[PDB]
Design an enzyme around this catalytic site. Structure first.
Site, PDB file in Angstrom:
ATOM      1  N   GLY A  10       0.812  -1.197   0.000  1.00 45.69           N
ATOM      2  CA  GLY A  10       0.000   0.000   0.000  1.00 45.69           C
ATOM      3  C   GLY A  10       0.849   1.252   0.000  1.00 45.69           C
ATOM      4  N   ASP A 107     -13.085   5.543  10.946  1.00 44.16           N
ATOM      5  CA  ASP A 107     -12.881   5.613   9.496  1.00 44.16           C
ATOM      6  C   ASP A 107     -13.183   4.280   8.786  1.00 44.16           C
ATOM      7  OD1 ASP A 107     -10.279   6.631   7.128  1.00 44.16           O
ATOM      8  OD2 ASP A 107     -12.374   7.269   7.252  1.00 44.16           O
TER       9      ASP A 107
HETATM   10  C1  LIG Z   1      -3.615  -4.261  -1.187  1.00 42.14           C
HETATM   11  C2  LIG Z   1      -3.158  -4.569   0.216  1.00 42.14           C
HETATM   12  O1  LIG Z   1      -2.757  -5.686   0.520  1.00 42.14           O
HETATM   13  N1  LIG Z   1      -3.210  -3.546   1.052  1.00 42.14           N
HETATM   14  C3  LIG Z   1      -2.818  -3.745   2.289  1.00 42.14           C
HETATM   15  N2  LIG Z   1      -2.559  -2.829   3.204  1.00 42.14           N
HETATM   16  C4  LIG Z   1      -2.162  -3.340   4.378  1.00 42.14           C
HETATM   17  C5  LIG Z   1      -2.125  -4.698   4.364  1.00 42.14           C
HETATM   18  S1  LIG Z   1      -2.561  -5.204   2.894  1.00 42.14           S
HETATM   19  C6  LIG Z   1      -1.761  -5.635   5.457  1.00 42.14           C
HETATM   20  O2  LIG Z   1      -1.436  -6.771   5.127  1.00 42.14           O
HETATM   21  N3  LIG Z   1      -1.864  -5.460   6.776  1.00 42.14           N
HETATM   22  C7  LIG Z   1      -2.185  -4.270   7.569  1.00 42.14           C
HETATM   23  C8  LIG Z   1      -2.621  -3.009   6.826  1.00 42.14           C
HETATM   24  C9  LIG Z   1      -1.776  -2.577   5.634  1.00 42.14           C
END
Ligand SMILES: CC(=O)Nc1nc2c(s1)C(=O)NCCC2
EC number: 2.7.11.1
Length: 246
Positions: A10, A107
């Site tokens: 992300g 949120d």
């Molecule tokens: C597309 C995707 O996998 N987005 C993700 N953001 C996060 C992901 S996955 C995660 O695996 N764990 C905690 C929040 C941050």
């Protein structure tokens, strides 16, 4: 215990998130990279539930190979009703839990709802979360927070308001998104035509036209403008659509 940064998962907000695999054990985790932060870590430390993103250390967070719920919502269509219901059951289990320990996320939206390998839903991102009950004592909120299309109406017209109904409202907007592939309005203000229509019960319009009557009956109960009149989570648990076998 020497993690590797395999890829960016992300981006956005202060920092960006990456996938981190342990060199030895090979456990996969996610790393949020930020250079406000003290409370997120504080709050994360309280959290232990199967529908909340696990906090490991510091940020080191449970890895959700499933992605965002948002990416399971086909635009203008949504998703099969049974999937929506299962995701909503789990969204509710997660929120009941947070509210139980006096935490509000503030949120809730499909971008902040992650999925693991078995498509289990995980509430993620407490950077906006705050304490609304401490020592059995409720504190009304006063800071405006969140994302306009998911935010409850009272947050926009009252100096202070209760935390729980705000989270209930946003869960309703999510349910709408899941069953229609679209958001009903830009924001729940009177100036907004789409929100005025809903208040006038013009359910022959989108997105409500696309939603079966059982789920929609629940949305009528959740998306109630007066937070005192809005349905509570224990009462959502008794709702007919919520309890309909699918
Ligand atoms: C597309 C995707 O996998 N987005 C993700 N953001 C996060 C992901 S996955 C995660 O695996 N764990 C905690 C929040 C941050």
């Amino acid at each position: 215990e020497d993690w590797d940064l395999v890829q960016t998962l992300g981006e956005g907000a202060y920092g960006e998130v990456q996938l981190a695999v342990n060199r030895v054990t090979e456990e996969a985790v996610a790393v949020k990279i930020v250079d406000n932060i003290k409370k997120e870590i504080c709050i994360n430390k309280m959290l232990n539930h199967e529908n909340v993103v696990k906090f490991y250390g510091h940020l080191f967070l449970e890895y959700c190979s499933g992605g965002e719920l948002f990416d399971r919502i086909e635009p203008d269509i949504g998703m099969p009703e049974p999937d929506a219901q299962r995701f909503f059951h789990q969204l509710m289990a997660g929120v009941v839990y947070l509210h139980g320990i006096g935490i509000t996320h503030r949120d809730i939206k499909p971008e902040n709802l992650l999925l693991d390998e078995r498509d289990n839903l995980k509430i993620s991102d407490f950077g906006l979360a705050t304490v609304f009950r401490y020592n059995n004592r409720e504190r009304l909120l006063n800071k405006m927070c969140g994302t306009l299309p998911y935010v409850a109406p009272e947050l926009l017209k009252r100096r202070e308001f209760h935390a729980e109904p705000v989270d209930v409202w946003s869960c309703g907007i999510v349910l709408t998104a899941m069953l229609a592939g679209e958001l009903p309005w830009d924001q729940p203000s009177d100036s907004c035509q789409e929100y005025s229509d809903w208040k006038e019960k013009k359910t022959y319009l989108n997105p409500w036209k696309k939603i079966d009557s059982a789920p929609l009956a629940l949305l009528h109960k959740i998306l109630v403008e007066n937070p005192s009149a809005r349905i509570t989570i224990p009462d959502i648990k008794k709702d007919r659509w919520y309890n309909k076998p699918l």
